[PDB]
PDB file of C-alpha atoms in Angstrom:
ATOM      1  CA  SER A   1      82.988 105.550 113.206  1.00 32.44           C
ATOM      2  CA  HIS A   2      85.307 107.390 115.435  1.00 33.26           C
ATOM      3  CA  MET A   3      84.385 110.788 113.226  1.00 29.36           C
ATOM      4  CA  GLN A   4      82.142 111.215 110.516  1.00 28.05           C
ATOM      5  CA  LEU A   5      82.684 113.618 107.617  1.00 24.34           C
ATOM      6  CA  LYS A   6      82.664 114.280 103.984  1.00 24.10           C
ATOM      7  CA  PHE A   7      84.866 112.897 101.872  1.00 21.47           C
ATOM      8  CA  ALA A   8      86.553 113.534  98.261  1.00 20.46           C
ATOM      9  CA  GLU A   9      84.458 111.680  94.933  1.00 21.56           C
ATOM     10  CA  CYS A  10      87.751 110.057  93.170  1.00 19.68           C
ATOM     11  CA  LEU A  11      87.978 107.925  96.514  1.00 20.54           C
ATOM     12  CA  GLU A  12      84.784 106.059  94.002  1.00 18.94           C
ATOM     13  CA  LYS A  13      87.749 104.475  91.865  1.00 20.35           C
ATOM     14  CA  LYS A  14      88.189 101.627  94.778  1.00 20.01           C
ATOM     15  CA  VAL A  15      91.430  99.793  93.975  1.00 19.50           C
ATOM     16  CA  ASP A  16      92.389  96.257  94.812  1.00 14.19           C
ATOM     17  CA  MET A  17      95.449  95.280  96.887  1.00 13.24           C
ATOM     18  CA  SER A  18      95.272  92.229  96.041  1.00 13.94           C
ATOM     19  CA  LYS A  19      96.728  93.280  91.868  1.00 15.51           C
ATOM     20  CA  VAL A  20      98.815  96.784  93.520  1.00 19.34           C
ATOM     21  CA  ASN A  21     101.219  96.407  96.005  1.00 16.49           C
ATOM     22  CA  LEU A  22     100.456  98.728  99.713  1.00 13.54           C
ATOM     23  CA  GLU A  23     103.799  97.716 101.754  1.00 13.17           C
ATOM     24  CA  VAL A  24     105.472 100.420  98.352  1.00 11.76           C
ATOM     25  CA  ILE A  25     102.614 102.767 100.106  1.00 11.86           C
ATOM     26  CA  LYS A  26     103.241 101.863 103.063  1.00 11.55           C
ATOM     27  CA  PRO A  27     106.511 104.312 103.249  1.00 13.43           C
ATOM     28  CA  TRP A  28     104.080 106.747 101.057  1.00 16.59           C
ATOM     29  CA  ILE A  29     101.135 106.381 103.611  1.00 14.28           C
ATOM     30  CA  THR A  30     103.378 105.889 106.634  1.00 13.39           C
ATOM     31  CA  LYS A  31     105.596 109.912 104.803  1.00 14.51           C
ATOM     32  CA  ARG A  32     102.448 111.580 103.948  1.00 14.01           C
ATOM     33  CA  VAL A  33     100.807 111.085 107.359  1.00 11.77           C
ATOM     34  CA  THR A  34     103.635 111.579 108.967  1.00 10.06           C
ATOM     35  CA  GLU A  35     104.285 114.884 107.133  1.00  9.07           C
ATOM     36  CA  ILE A  36     101.215 115.734 107.125  1.00  9.63           C
ATOM     37  CA  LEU A  37     101.327 116.991 110.882  1.00 13.15           C
ATOM     38  CA  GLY A  38     105.301 116.315 111.110  1.00 13.05           C
ATOM     39  CA  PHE A  39     105.148 113.215 113.458  1.00 14.86           C
ATOM     40  CA  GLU A  40     104.895 109.110 112.715  1.00 15.40           C
ATOM     41  CA  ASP A  41     101.851 108.396 113.544  1.00 12.22           C
ATOM     42  CA  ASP A  42     100.474 105.079 114.451  1.00 11.34           C
ATOM     43  CA  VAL A  43      96.291 105.547 114.907  1.00 12.71           C
ATOM     44  CA  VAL A  44      95.961 106.664 111.369  1.00 11.49           C
ATOM     45  CA  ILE A  45      99.161 104.528 109.942  1.00  8.55           C
ATOM     46  CA  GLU A  46      97.496 101.535 111.228  1.00  6.52           C
ATOM     47  CA  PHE A  47      93.850 102.633 109.608  1.00  2.00           C
ATOM     48  CA  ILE A  48      95.505 102.682 106.305  1.00  2.00           C
ATOM     49  CA  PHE A  49      98.100  99.669 107.254  1.00  2.17           C
ATOM     50  CA  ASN A  50      94.235  97.410 108.453  1.00  4.87           C
ATOM     51  CA  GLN A  51      92.733  99.020 105.897  1.00  7.14           C
ATOM     52  CA  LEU A  52      94.893  98.438 103.458  1.00  5.35           C
ATOM     53  CA  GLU A  53      95.684  95.148 104.305  1.00  9.84           C
ATOM     54  CA  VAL A  54      92.242  93.953 103.158  1.00  9.59           C
ATOM     55  CA  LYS A  55      91.792  93.548  98.982  1.00 10.87           C
ATOM     56  CA  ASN A  56      89.260  95.970  99.036  1.00 10.09           C
ATOM     57  CA  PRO A  57      90.080  99.373 101.411  1.00 11.89           C
ATOM     58  CA  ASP A  58      86.914 101.412 102.360  1.00 11.64           C
ATOM     59  CA  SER A  59      88.947 104.718 101.217  1.00 13.20           C
ATOM     60  CA  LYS A  60      85.775 106.381 103.084  1.00 10.44           C
ATOM     61  CA  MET A  61      86.933 105.587 106.471  1.00 12.68           C
ATOM     62  CA  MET A  62      90.457 105.998 105.542  1.00 12.18           C
ATOM     63  CA  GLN A  63      89.035 109.827 104.949  1.00 10.19           C
ATOM     64  CA  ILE A  64      87.000 109.167 107.747  1.00 12.05           C
ATOM     65  CA  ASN A  65      89.800 107.716 110.427  1.00 14.49           C
ATOM     66  CA  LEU A  66      91.873 110.149 108.441  1.00 15.94           C
ATOM     67  CA  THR A  67      89.957 113.518 109.357  1.00 16.08           C
ATOM     68  CA  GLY A  68      90.304 112.496 112.868  1.00 14.96           C
ATOM     69  CA  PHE A  69      94.034 113.136 113.021  1.00 14.09           C
ATOM     70  CA  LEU A  70      94.281 115.464 110.305  1.00 20.92           C
ATOM     71  CA  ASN A  71      92.910 118.229 109.412  1.00 23.26           C
ATOM     72  CA  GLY A  72      90.228 117.916 107.369  1.00 23.92           C
ATOM     73  CA  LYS A  73      91.743 118.719 104.341  1.00 22.35           C
ATOM     74  CA  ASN A  74      95.188 117.101 104.318  1.00 21.87           C
ATOM     75  CA  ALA A  75      93.071 113.830 104.344  1.00 20.97           C
ATOM     76  CA  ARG A  76      91.037 114.460 101.530  1.00 20.26           C
ATOM     77  CA  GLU A  77      94.471 115.649  99.722  1.00 19.15           C
ATOM     78  CA  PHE A  78      96.425 112.083 100.839  1.00 19.31           C
ATOM     79  CA  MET A  79      93.559 110.443 100.107  1.00 17.74           C
ATOM     80  CA  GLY A  80      93.744 111.843  96.672  1.00 16.61           C
ATOM     81  CA  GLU A  81      97.567 111.316  96.382  1.00 14.82           C
ATOM     82  CA  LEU A  82      96.838 107.492  97.334  1.00 13.53           C
ATOM     83  CA  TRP A  83      94.391 106.336  96.276  1.00 12.72           C
ATOM     84  CA  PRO A  84      95.570 107.441  92.393  1.00 13.50           C
ATOM     85  CA  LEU A  85      99.043 105.990  93.422  1.00 14.33           C
ATOM     86  CA  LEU A  86      96.356 102.607  93.937  1.00 19.28           C
ATOM     87  CA  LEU A  87      95.320 102.997  90.439  1.00 18.22           C
ATOM     88  CA  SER A  88      98.915 103.109  89.103  1.00 18.89           C
ATOM     89  CA  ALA A  89      99.867 101.004  91.017  1.00 20.21           C
ATOM     90  CA  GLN A  90      96.895  98.018  90.197  1.00 20.01           C
ATOM     91  CA  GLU A  91      97.831  98.844  86.364  1.00 18.62           C
ATOM     92  CA  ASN A  92     101.423  97.404  87.051  1.00 21.06           C
ATOM     93  CA  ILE A  93     102.458  94.300  87.625  1.00 22.41           C
ATOM     94  CA  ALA A  94     104.280  94.375  90.642  1.00 26.10           C
ATOM     95  CA  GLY A  95     101.561  96.571  91.939  1.00 22.92           C
ATOM     96  CA  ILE A  96     104.029 100.032  91.891  1.00 22.67           C
ATOM     97  CA  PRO A  97     102.831 103.269  91.257  1.00 18.12           C
ATOM     98  CA  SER A  98     104.745 104.910  88.359  1.00 16.88           C
ATOM     99  CA  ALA A  99     105.466 107.073  90.895  1.00 19.58           C
ATOM    100  CA  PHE A 100     108.242 105.179  91.769  1.00 17.71           C
ATOM    101  CA  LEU A 101     108.918 102.791  88.923  1.00 17.64           C
ATOM    102  CA  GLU A 102     109.859 106.089  86.691  1.00 22.04           C
ATOM    103  CA  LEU A 103     111.297 108.260  89.832  1.00 28.26           C
ATOM    104  CA  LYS A 104     112.297 107.447  92.721  1.00 28.82           C
ATOM    105  CA  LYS A 105     114.029 107.668  96.246  1.00 27.55           C
ATOM    106  CA  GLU A 106     115.654 106.113  99.051  1.00 28.82           C
ATOM    107  CA  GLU A 107     113.590 105.046 102.256  1.00 28.11           C
ATOM    108  CA  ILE A 108     113.685 105.797 105.371  1.00 30.22           C
ATOM    109  CA  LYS A 109     112.428 104.749 108.623  1.00 30.94           C
ATOM    110  CA  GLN A 110     112.757 105.191 112.355  1.00 31.36           C
ATOM    111  CA  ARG A 111     111.928 103.531 115.038  1.00 30.26           C
TER     112      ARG A 111
END
């Protein structure tokens, strides 16, 4: 643990990457984390990516790790937006959240 702190409750909704696609959240998370500060991180991204690379990520560690870079409040809001994103994704078939199903947008990404 890099930095201990408090998290949200919705983070206790658990998830299942084996059911939902995390890759579809890579740009969402990467964009979120990037937008959170304004620049493309890596340590925070890796944390989510590495964590989202499992079948059962620890939102606690996610928010805890995020808080290590974020302001702390953004971590709670971020997790309460991505954690739920998977919740809906895990409810899909392709493991995609309605955020992408309904809405739609290009995929921006740079080095």
